[PDB]
Amino acid sequence: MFYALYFEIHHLVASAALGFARVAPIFFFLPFLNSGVLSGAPRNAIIILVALGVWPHALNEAPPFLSVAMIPLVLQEAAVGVMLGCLLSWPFWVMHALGCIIDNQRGATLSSSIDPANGIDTSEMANFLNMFAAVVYLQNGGLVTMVDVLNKSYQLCDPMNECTPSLPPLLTFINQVAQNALVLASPVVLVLLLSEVFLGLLSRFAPQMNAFAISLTVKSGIAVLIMLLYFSPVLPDNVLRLSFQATGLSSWFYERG
Amino acid sequence: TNRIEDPNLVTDPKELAISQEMISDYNLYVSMVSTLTRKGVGAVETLLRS
Amino acid sequence: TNRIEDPNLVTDPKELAISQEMISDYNLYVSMVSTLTRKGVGAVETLLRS
Amino acid sequence: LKEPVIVSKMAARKKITGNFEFHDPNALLEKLSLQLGLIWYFDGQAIYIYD
Amino acid sequence: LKEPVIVSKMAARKKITGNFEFHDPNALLEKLSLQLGLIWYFDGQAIYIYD
Amino acid sequence: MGNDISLIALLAFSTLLPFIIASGTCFVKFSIVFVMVRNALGLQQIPSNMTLNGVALLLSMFVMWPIMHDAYVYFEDEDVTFNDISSLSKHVDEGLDGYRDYLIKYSDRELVQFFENAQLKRQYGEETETVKRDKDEIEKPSIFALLPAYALSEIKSAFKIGFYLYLPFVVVDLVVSSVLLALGMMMMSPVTISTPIKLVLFVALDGWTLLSKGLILQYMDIA
Amino acid sequence: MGNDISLIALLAFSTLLPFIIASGTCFVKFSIVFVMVRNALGLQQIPSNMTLNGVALLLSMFVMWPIMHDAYVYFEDEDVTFNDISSLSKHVDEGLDGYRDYLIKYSDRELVQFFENAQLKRQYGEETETVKRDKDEIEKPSIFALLPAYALSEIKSAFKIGFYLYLPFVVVDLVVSSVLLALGMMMMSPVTISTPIKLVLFVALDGWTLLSKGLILQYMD
Amino acid sequence: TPWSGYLDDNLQTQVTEALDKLAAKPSDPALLAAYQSKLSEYNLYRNAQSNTVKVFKDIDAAIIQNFR
Amino acid sequence: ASEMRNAVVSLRNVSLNEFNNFLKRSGLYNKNYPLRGDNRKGTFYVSGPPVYVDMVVNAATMMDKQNDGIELGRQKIGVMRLNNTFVGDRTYNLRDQKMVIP
Amino acid sequence: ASEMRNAVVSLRNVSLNEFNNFLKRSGLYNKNYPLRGDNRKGTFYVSGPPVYVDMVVNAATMMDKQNDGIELGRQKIGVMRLNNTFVGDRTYNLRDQKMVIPGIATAIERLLQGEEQPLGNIVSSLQEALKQNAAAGNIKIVAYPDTNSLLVKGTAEQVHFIEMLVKALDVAKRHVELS
Amino acid sequence: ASEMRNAVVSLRNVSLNEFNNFLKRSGLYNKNYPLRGDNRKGTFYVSGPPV
Numbered sequence A: 001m002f003y004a005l006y007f008e009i010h011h012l013v014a015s016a017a018l019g020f021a022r023v024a025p026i027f028f029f030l031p032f033l034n035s036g037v038l039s040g041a042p043r044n045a046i047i048i049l050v051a052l053g054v055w056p057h058a059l060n061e062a063p064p065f066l067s068v069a070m071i072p073l074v075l076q077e078a079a080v081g082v083m084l085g086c087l088l089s090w091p092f093w094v095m096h097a098l099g100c101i102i103d104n105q106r107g108a109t110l111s112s113s114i115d116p117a118n119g120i121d122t123s124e125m126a127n128f129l130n131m132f133a134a135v136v137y138l139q140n141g142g143l144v145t146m147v148d149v150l151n152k153s154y155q156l157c158d159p160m161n162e163c164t165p166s167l168p169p170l171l172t173f174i175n176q177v178a179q180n181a182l183v184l185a186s187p188v189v190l191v192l193l194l195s196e197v198f199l200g201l202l203s204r205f206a207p208q209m210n211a212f213a214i215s216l217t218v219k220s221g222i223a224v225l226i227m228l229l230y231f232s233p234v235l236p237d238n239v240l241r242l243s244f245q246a247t248g249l250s251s252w253f254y255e256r257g
Numbered sequence B, C: 001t002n003r004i005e006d007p008n009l010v011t012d013p014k015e016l017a018i019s020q021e022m023i024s025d026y027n028l029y030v031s032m033v034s035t036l037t038r039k040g041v042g043a044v045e046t047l048l049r050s
Numbered sequence D, E: 001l002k003e004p005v006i007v008s009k010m011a012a013r014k015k016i017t018g019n020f021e022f023h024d025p026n027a028l029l030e031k032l033s034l035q036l037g038l039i040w041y042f043d044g045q046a047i048y049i050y051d
Numbered sequence F: 001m002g003n004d005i006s007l008i009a010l011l012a013f014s015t016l017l018p019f020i021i022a023s024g025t026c027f028v029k030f031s032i033v034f035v036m037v038r039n040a041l042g043l044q045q046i047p048s049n050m051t052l053n054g055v056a057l058l059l060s061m062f063v064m065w066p067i068m069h070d071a072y073v074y075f076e077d078e079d080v081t082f083n084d085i086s087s088l089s090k091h092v093d094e095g096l097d098g099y100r101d102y103l104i105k106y107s108d109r110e111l112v113q114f115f116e117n118a119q120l121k122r123q124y125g126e127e128t129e130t131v132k133r134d135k136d137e138i139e140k141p142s143i144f145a146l147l148p149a150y151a152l153s154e155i156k157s158a159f160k161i162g163f164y165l166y167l168p169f170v171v172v173d174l175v176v177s178s179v180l181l182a183l184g185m186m187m188m189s190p191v192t193i194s195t196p197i198k199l200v201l202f203v204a205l206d207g208w209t210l211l212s213k214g215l216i217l218q219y220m221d222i223a
Numbered sequence G: 001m002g003n004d005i006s007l008i009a010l011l012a013f014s015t016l017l018p019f020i021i022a023s024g025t026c027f028v029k030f031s032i033v034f035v036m037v038r039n040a041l042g043l044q045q046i047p048s049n050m051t052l053n054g055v056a057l058l059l060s061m062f063v064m065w066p067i068m069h070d071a072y073v074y075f076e077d078e079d080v081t082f083n084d085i086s087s088l089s090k091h092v093d094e095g096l097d098g099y100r101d102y103l104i105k106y107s108d109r110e111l112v113q114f115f116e117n118a119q120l121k122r123q124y125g126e127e128t129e130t131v132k133r134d135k136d137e138i139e140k141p142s143i144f145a146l147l148p149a150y151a152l153s154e155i156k157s158a159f160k161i162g163f164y165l166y167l168p169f170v171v172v173d174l175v176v177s178s179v180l181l182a183l184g185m186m187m188m189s190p191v192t193i194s195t196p197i198k199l200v201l202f203v204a205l206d207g208w209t210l211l212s213k214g215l216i217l218q219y220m221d
Numbered sequence H: 001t002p003w004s005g006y007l008d009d010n011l012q013t014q015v016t017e018a019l020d021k022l023a024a025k026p027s028d029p030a031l032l033a034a035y036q037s038k039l040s041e042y043n044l045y046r047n048a049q050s051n052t053v054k055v056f057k058d059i060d061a062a063i064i065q066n067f068r
Numbered sequence I: 001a002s003e004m005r006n007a008v009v010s011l012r013n014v015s016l017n018e019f020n021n022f023l024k025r026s027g028l029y030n031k032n033y034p035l036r037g038d039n040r041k042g043t044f045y046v047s048g049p050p051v052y053v054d055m056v057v058n059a060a061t062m063m064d065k066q067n068d069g070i071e072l073g074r075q076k077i078g079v080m081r082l083n084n085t086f087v088g089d090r091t092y093n094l095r096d097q098k099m100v101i102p
Numbered sequence J: 001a002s003e004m005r006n007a008v009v010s011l012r013n014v015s016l017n018e019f020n021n022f023l024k025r026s027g028l029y030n031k032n033y034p035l036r037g038d039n040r041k042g043t044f045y046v047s048g049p050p051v052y053v054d055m056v057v058n059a060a061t062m063m064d065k066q067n068d069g070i071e072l073g074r075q076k077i078g079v080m081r082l083n084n085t086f087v088g089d090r091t092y093n094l095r096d097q098k099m100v101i102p103g104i105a106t107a108i109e110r111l112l113q114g115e116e117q118p119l120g121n122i123v124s125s126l127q128e129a130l131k132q133n134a135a136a137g138n139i140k141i142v143a144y145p146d147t148n149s150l151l152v153k154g155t156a157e158q159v160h161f162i163e164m165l166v167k168a169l170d171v172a173k174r175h176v177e178l179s
Numbered sequence K: 001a002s003e004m005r006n007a008v009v010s011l012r013n014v015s016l017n018e019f020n021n022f023l024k025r026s027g028l029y030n031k032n033y034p035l036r037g038d039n040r041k042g043t044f045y046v047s048g049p050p051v
């Protein structure tokens, strides 16, 4: 049948187009994929190739969605993609919070770091630890788990079944992210508090001593010194214990159709 | 249609005038979906930055 | 469409001359509605992103 | 029935429960057809069932 | 059966469990075809099985 | 094929979509309350604006997506017939009532009525307003009249809520300061002590969870 | 040309060429490393993207040229070579191994394996045995499966290289911030002071020489 | 032009010869009857050839102009 | 096993027997995958491993086309002596009419 | 081993038993990968290493084109004496009719005139079949009274058949006396 | 060694024995890579260095 190859190419591009809606938001969140790094002509070419690498159905048979209103569908897929972008981001936002807490305790309120791509305020420590976590995550091969959890998302819940994120856990999400950062930062805050009250108690004997101005000289040195001891566990304490994993897809999403 | 009736009907002017409608309309439909997805993603990025 | 399906219309110069006009007027009308709509939404977008 | 049986998707949506005896299955089939609102046919090779 | 067997992609989804004795594979093939809802054929070179 | 004007309407709508969301949807409220609470805890950039906007966006969809889907299901309906521009206008307007009702629920009647007057009364030689009995106009305020009246009411609600959340943190600040004075450990700035306390206290009570539930329960039942 | 379909295919290829360069050549890597350097120094608009992409494309030419030349003379070659459909399809397929060898030499084995298995499970069904070719000769994988693995591999390694370059400037920034707090000038924005120290540091290193040397030596012995 | 690597004039002399015979004795009915046939066939041959060569040129040109 | 290929072939100038003898002489024949059809006719079904099927199809097609260069409607001449009459036509010169008998 | 190639080759002017001789004389023959087919016919299968296969298929195609230029339908001239009759046509002027009796040449020529199928037989191997295909209309007969003999031009087979027919026709006539 | 080229050449008007003499007179002939074929016919195979 003569026209069959022509139609078979059009089925391919319709499938890729509907996959872009779900893959591109992930490229927006992750720190090594956002347009602060990967921009221009490569960007679309790569996103499309990935989406075709993970689409779940044989590419040469007609797409099933031709009978459906396009907008409700596109919005559905974009929402799903935003949820996945958050869950995959989760290990990086904790280290970023940690760095912001440290740079706030040591003074340093007027930090210099720059970041226009994501539109978020940044400080030198936050930028450093956010980079460092990303390189150890990549070096542990996590990039394979990212495409694994993408493919599983299509097998476990399908665009045509109106797959939807579960509400109850989403209501917990922000507080879990805050909690992990505080639990991890706690050792540096306590020592920086005790160091200040020690100078306060010392000032009782010499009331002209400016204990505040002294503490500003000390605290950045103490903060780096202490963070340098508990540094090495920062490798495993993120590479596994905070990384999302594909078995979690069962609980965060369900099919509503 | 896979090995039923016959192939290669490049040549009869009555069926060749029916193919013109389909070959055009499916190209337009596929072109439209490509824009709608870009618009949607762009709207999400616009809100999240702002 | 009817003016073309009907055999006495599609084969008389007097009628063809009229159909030519109908087609052109249709083209111009739709093209102008589209243009002005785009210009309109583009104004809103220009102001709100400023 | 001694014949392969082929069921349309719109018939596949319907559910049934209970304890059934398959004797004179043609009669059973034609009765259930009317109770459940199905239509069916037999070309000589297999049985087709539709909503 | 003494013949190569080819099973379709859609039949391969079904699952079976138990002990089976192959005294008469032809009879067993027919019984299980009717029980599980399969059709099959034999060109003289190989056996083909479909949903 | 389809109709060439309904195609224009589809493409146009999809360009305006983010401004509608940003100005006529509960996103307006959710995105404000979170950022206020974040400032009150006294430590900006934790959580990120990315986290906050992302969550607010997701929650807004539970409220709004059913209404849009209901409207498209209303229009994809093969049994209608029309005769005139009026008979079509009526049916298209009728399609939007699902959204109109939501805006009417969450906005002020008198500000809506004020703008409903202001669209016309520069035309008018008269003072009487009774001239249409209410039952039509009370149902049919225009959408352009409803939109700004809704946004201006959402903002005010957001401030009302955030006000009550500020109070306990203020109290905590006063307590800390009074303790430092009663100890005479005077020359220490209290903020350094109280910001850790505010953070640990609010996280240990899951303020963000209670907050998220309390916001959604104005608009849905979770069960 | 001696044949018309041979012409149609050539015009199609020449119409899709730029995306193949944008997604299956080292250009994807050079382009990233230079933007990383500009981020590191804390600059916004200078050097321009057109200047950095200019040098990135020139450098990519030295690396890709030999296999494009090889494919060119292979397809020009005037000696009689094919007779019939099977011989033609094998002749065309054989002509692409010069480039499959390239993609395979730099793609990550784990990603190549993932994209291959996930295609087998599309075509032949998910019950087909998951290969786990842990010790492997990957049997000439399909180029549609091979190409996105290369793209993500180059993104990985370019990010990795870019990370290392930050660490000196990170030091500079934290030091300056500490000495200003030691003087109590809390209201001074450090960036004004730290920007020139970064510039003179990079110039003293001669960064662009070292970096452009090593980036090329990674592709040839 | 050859497709690279792919595996895989008498009528002019005949007309010339017949012309030379005829020119020697223009009044011979047998030489006239022969020349009439040779010339008619040669004429048809040249026309069919040149029409075909144009048809192939115009297909190659249309292909290029489609992508150009 | 899943790679089995099969096809239908139809020839005009060659008999299935002719082709089978070709295969046998070649030493290419394989009794596990023989050709199935009518020896008299030219239409047969073949199924088996790829190499075998492809080879059979190509060989059959080319052999069929080759034989168009052949002709077998051999004309034959017979001599039949008339025992009871003259062969030629006869004219009878009647004084009033010329009559011809074919 | 995975690189094994194979092909089916077909010929029009040469036989497998010919082409083998060429390979042998060349010193290219290889008994591990011999050609498989029928010596009588021009169609064979070959399989082996790339270089070998390509060489074989090239050489066989080009030799077939070279032999395509050589004709082999050698025309043979046969001279046949008649022993029992006169070669020419004759006219007898009856009172009632001008009457004519046609000779052998005229009769046979008129009969074969415009024939297109081969001449098979009379009643009262690819390189062979392509000779047997010769058309019947080419046979030319010229009567030569000087020696009462026929000149016959055709293939060796055709001339033979003509000889048989002549010897079936020129019977000796009986004499009758009318009183 | 990996560069050895080879080709099949055929001539209409000139026999192999006629061509070998040409190469001999020229001083171009090389007994390590001689032509392989039938001296009578005009078709031969040659292989060797590119030049």
Ligand SMILES: CCCCCCCCCCCC[N+](C)(C)[O-]
Pocket (backbone or CB within 6 Å): A075, A076, A079, A080, A164, A165, F058, F061, F062, F063, F065, F066, F221, F222, F223
């Ligand atoms: C997350 C936005 C995209 C998917 C659309 C979700 C529509 C709302 C469905 C809510 C169903 C809630 N429920 C089960 C209590 O009815």
